[PDB]
Amino acid sequence: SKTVLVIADLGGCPPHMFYKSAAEKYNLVSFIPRPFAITASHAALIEKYSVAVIKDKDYFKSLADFEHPDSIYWAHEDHNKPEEEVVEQIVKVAEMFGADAITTNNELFIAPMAKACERLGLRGAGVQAAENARDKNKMRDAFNKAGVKSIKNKRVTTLEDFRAALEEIGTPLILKPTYLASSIGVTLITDTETAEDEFNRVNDYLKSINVPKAVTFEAPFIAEEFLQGEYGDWYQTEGYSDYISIEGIMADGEYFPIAIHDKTPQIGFTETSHITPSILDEEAKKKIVEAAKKANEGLGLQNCATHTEIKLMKNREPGLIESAARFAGANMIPNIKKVFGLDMAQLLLDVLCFGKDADLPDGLLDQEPYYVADCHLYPQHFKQNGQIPETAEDLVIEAIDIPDGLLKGDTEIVSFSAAAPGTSVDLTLFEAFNSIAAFELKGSNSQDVAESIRQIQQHAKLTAKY
Amino acid sequence: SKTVLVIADLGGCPPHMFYKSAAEKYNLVSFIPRPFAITASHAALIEKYSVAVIKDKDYFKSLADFEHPDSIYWAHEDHNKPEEEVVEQIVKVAEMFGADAITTNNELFIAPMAKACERLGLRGAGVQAAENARDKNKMRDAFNKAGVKSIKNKRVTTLEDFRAALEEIGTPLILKPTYLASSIGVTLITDTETAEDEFNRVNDYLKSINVPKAVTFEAPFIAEEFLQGEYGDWYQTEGYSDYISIEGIMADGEYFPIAIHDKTPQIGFTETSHITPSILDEEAKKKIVEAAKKANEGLGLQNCATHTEIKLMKNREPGLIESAARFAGANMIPNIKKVFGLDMAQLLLDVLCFGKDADLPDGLLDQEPYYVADCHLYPQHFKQNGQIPETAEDLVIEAIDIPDGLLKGDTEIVSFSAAAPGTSVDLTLFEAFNSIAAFELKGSNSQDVAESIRQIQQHAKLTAKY
Ligand SMILES: Nc1ncnc2c1ncn2[C@@H]1O[C@H](COP(=O)(O)OP(=O)(O)O)[C@@H](O)[C@H]1O
Ligand SMILES: Nc1ncnc2c1ncn2[C@@H]1O[C@H](COP(=O)(O)OP(=O)(O)O)[C@@H](O)[C@H]1O
Ligand SMILES: [Mg+2]
Ligand SMILES: [Mg+2]
Ligand SMILES: [Mg+2]
Ligand SMILES: [Mg+2]
């Protein structure tokens, strides 16, 4: 048999699939470096499917530190431990249990996990490649080197640094952190000269969030070109957006594409829905693939899952927004299984343990029996039909209801879940920590699923305290 | 700090106290040799309070072996692994986590745990002493040697072996297994000569239950004198029974008594209630102590908790029924904490880790603010007011209700729990796998608590399908 070590923490392939998928085929062992990062339902899936579990004991100081929260937007809690230490912890756990492989669904641990794998002679992302995938400046340089759509980009520390960039890069302009997630601090520029009395506010805002002491950024911000979208050169119907993600496996340095996902449009920069698989035509998908191939091999990644965001630009130029050496979040990975029957968690484990003896698809998965959409509603969506006032520093919610007749064609609601009756929702916090409803749709016609979603976003009834 | 390894399985100090008590003061690590022995609520308390958990992985063959039952009467499941193997497993886990101590609440693991502790140089029961406490014949010989009430006793294998015993020991006569728990096969003899066409039925019945492959019995049965009780030489009021248990800690070979428990009377040989602490007078308790001191030092036990059952015989002779080198079961250990504020789980851990530097009471705990009673109702109790027919191979239950006005004096019901509406109860199974209700009473007058219990057993309303 084979023993897989999982560094268990937030994001990526969700726990409700990951542990069962892994334990089906492997002896699963869990390391939990951040016990506070672990929801109650998460802990329960860890304990249920792992033959062994270790938590970093330094975290527990009283009995109440043994409490599991119901939900965690982000680990807003100091992890004051340098990278070399994390690596050591991982190596130690892997040796204690004779791990044949190490994976993680959490970005924060990708770098250190690569280092341990190399030291242990196990398959991994590759030490340098993981560095590249974790510093945005290094990720950019590598992409340019790899020959995918190349754009201007400067490291940014001060405002004195901000001037030289704004002047060079121009409008539209993106400035964002080198190391963080959930699009925090990621700032847009359509006005030309307010940027300054607006860079100095988002310079501070990065000093309230928390990451571990183990993610190296050689400069705090990057500035680079905003990738302009051109919806009409790509999609043939309304309902999607001008970006996509594609999911893949890297095996032995080679990129294997699995599935591309369509999106419904964002709100600000918060994502709303992921549709499995894309309706995009085969030529378009071939360009998307080709670009993710170059990007990811361009990082040097060896053995890992990938999640790559690509902006659909004019002339069908695919523009690399970002790639990570871990599974997509939300429900994308489960939905790939439901549609095609392929379990990408298992597939990656087969790669970590057996290399190209794993059964990797030859090209994107095809012959989808139907489309599955992973969708979320947010407060903004309702404020986007009036339901919320613009002074309303909070609101409380009793029910969210989907009237009948919104579904187009054979679309169908598979599941739906609303936030708890009496739920306190402060409306001066980011929306991507603020999903107040969640639904899945199935259907054999993509444009209608997509349209059915627009309709739910429009007409779903909130009942709440104004 | 200090790392305690718990071999987690059934019985003893119940999980709802043990893990929280241990984790309060120690870094707790759990080994689970029998994952099937672990209820859902148990697993959840393990994962919540342990900094590390290992399960014996050989048990998992499909995904469904990862299911936790709600309740487990007994681990009716083959554990085909010889003692030397268990020992090895325990030693390996203790080394993997640098355990400073090992404990268990489950009798089946006492012998092997002593061996590992000795090999590891950690405090324990003592290898021979644990053997003595686990083979009933060896426990008897040791008690006789120790000078506590001595009685006739022969090893029994066949019926040819049964003849020589019955003739020597006489009526009343007890014959029971050397190695099992919950009073299975424990058989009474008031008739003189039916015993034979009744020994040959209870010879077979031991071959349906299961124990691990790691408990040595050099003869399958023992026969010995039934210890006759004489209630009236001990208690001054009605309501108790003619046996007691006493709870203690062995530290460095010396017995430290903690608390004696009264009982309400049994049904068959199933226990009904445990009252913390005994109302027995100080001379009576001094005899009880003195007898448990000799018994337990007589076993040679070094470092462990003890639970010792003593029969209250005529002339105030305390008769040793049995002693185990682990905590009492049911809720006796929690109730000791509630009454006196002493946490005996912690106290034992302090002994395992620090020896007589622990804070051991000097004599039984006194100054009880009040009595707490841990009580259970069974089917028989209701069949003991008609509620069940004598053909009724099963019954289903909707509610069990305590009418008002049954409580005497300032007695009070603290908690009460009935079996689930629609619960299937086969009435050709042992009653001590069959608790269908559970209550706790508090009160400052013992005789009334005891009497309040009799009244609940009498008059509690069942509503069920006849
Ligand atoms: N350079 C860019 N050009 C266009 N859109 C971007 C750019 N960077 C970020 N975005 C938008 O914001 C989202 C978050 O970007 P990303 O850099 O992936 O931040 P995060 O790490 O928080 O996901 C992207 O999916 C994209 O829609
Ligand atoms: N030798 C005995 N004399 C009197 N009663 C006994 C004897 N052995 C067992 N019993 C009764 O049956 C119960 C179970 O006995 P024990 O030997 O402790 O079996 P178990 O290991 O199942 O608890 C005792 O608490 C006692 O009430
Ligand atoms: Mg990201
Ligand atoms: Mg991103
Ligand atoms: Mg017993
Ligand atoms: Mg007993």
Side-chain angles (χ1 to χ4, degrees), chain B residues 283-439:
Chain B
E283 278 291 283
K285 295 190 299 193
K286 158 195 303 182
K287 289 159 172 306
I288 291 165
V289 167
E290 166 168 35
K293 180 187 174 63
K294 274 150 84 166
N296 280 298
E297 288 167 18
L299 263 10
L301 290 166
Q302 300 291 300
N303 290 294
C304 66
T306 56
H307 180 231
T308 304
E309 292 178 310
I310 284 157
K311 184 75 148 146
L312 306 181
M313 301 184 296
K314 68 165 201 307
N315 299 316
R316 267 183 175 210
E317 232 219 315
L320 262 297
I321 301 180
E322 192 179 46
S323 200
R326 47 86 184 162
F327 284 117
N331 245 358
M332 277 174 270
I333 303 295
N335 284 176
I336 288 166
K337 197 194 193 142
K338 298 181 200 169
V339 175
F340 302 106
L342 174 123
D343 185 321
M344 216 178 132
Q346 292 174 348
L347 172 58
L348 167 69
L349 293 196
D350 288 343
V351 168
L352 298 172
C353 291
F354 297 101
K356 270 167 186 188
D357 296 17
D359 194 19
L360 290 135
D362 182 18
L364 295 168
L365 294 191
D366 63 7
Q367 309 203 37
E368 51 270 11
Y370 48 70
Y371 299 88
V372 184
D374 185 46
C375 314
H376 291 265
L377 301 183
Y378 303 92
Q380 197 57 47
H381 272 133
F382 289 97
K383 199 189 268 167
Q384 203 164 94
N385 353 93
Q387 308 323 334
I388 293 174
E390 324 313 292
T391 327
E393 288 161 3
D394 21 325
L395 87 153
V396 192
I397 299 167
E398 194 176 44
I400 294 170
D401 295 275
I402 297 176
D404 314 312
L406 298 181
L407 305 176
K408 311 325 269 284
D410 75 2
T411 296
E412 156 206 346
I413 294 143
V414 167
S415 87
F416 171 74
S417 89
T423 27
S424 78
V425 191
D426 167 41
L427 307 191
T428 58
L429 180 66
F430 200 60
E431 297 278 348
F433 306 133
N434 249 111
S435 161
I436 64 162
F439 60 103

Side-chain angles (χ1 to χ4, degrees), chain B residues 200-275:
Chain B
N200 297 313
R201 311 165 317 178
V202 318
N203 204 318
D204 205 324
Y205 217 103
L206 265 60
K207 313 168 175 204
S208 62
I209 309 299
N210 181 67
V211 286
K213 215 80 187 65
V215 194
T216 312
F217 63 89
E218 62 202 352
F221 272 102
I222 186 179
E224 64 174 14
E225 295 180 55
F226 179 59
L227 300 179
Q228 201 87 245
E230 190 63 33
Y231 191 85
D233 288 356
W234 296 80
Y235 289 106
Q236 288 160 15
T237 68
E238 19 174 266
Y240 310 104
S241 187
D242 57 350
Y243 83 119
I244 53 85
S245 68
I246 171 171
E247 330 310 336
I249 296 301
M250 294 302 303
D252 248 70
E254 192 181 342
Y255 181 67
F256 292 79
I258 302 295
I260 300 159
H261 281 101
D262 293 332
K263 319 290 177 161
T264 50
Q266 279 169 343
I267 312 180
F269 297 123
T270 309
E271 303 193 85
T272 58
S273 329
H274 316 282
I275 305 170

